[PDB]
Design a protein around this ligand. Sequence first.
Ligand code: UVS
Ligand code: ZN
Length: 140
Amino acid sequence: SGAIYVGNYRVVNRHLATHNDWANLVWEDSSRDLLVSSTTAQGCDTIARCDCQTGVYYCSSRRKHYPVSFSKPSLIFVEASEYYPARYQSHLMLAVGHSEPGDCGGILRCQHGVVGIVSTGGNGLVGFADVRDLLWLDEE
Ligand SMILES: COCc1nnc(N)s1
Ligand SMILES: [Zn+2]
């Protein structure tokens, strides 16, 4: 579990969005595993605006943050998980590391701020849904 809290936006994995998220929906994309909802209180996070390929992510199933190198966001085939069938996922970055389903929502961060959230795992990789292209998160 986990979210990004930027301005008056909550960014969550689409598959973990609540009824309240859907009732306060700003934007969602199943192909990216992302959903954004509106918040009453302003959030503490800053979105990275960069093309870094190194950062640190939080792994809940280890209670640990790991430094990783990761691929640039791409359209990637993802094998079946507990929460999605085998399918193509867009705007996905991969790193070598541990990820189980409950790790989804952990933040990946670089020197510029939040890069994305854990979205995929298995076979010794962790996949992250990028948010750095979502420039509208920074205003309004
Ligand atoms: C296509 O759906 C976008 C949205 N729907 N309700 C909102 N409040 S934003
Ligand atoms: Zn960066």
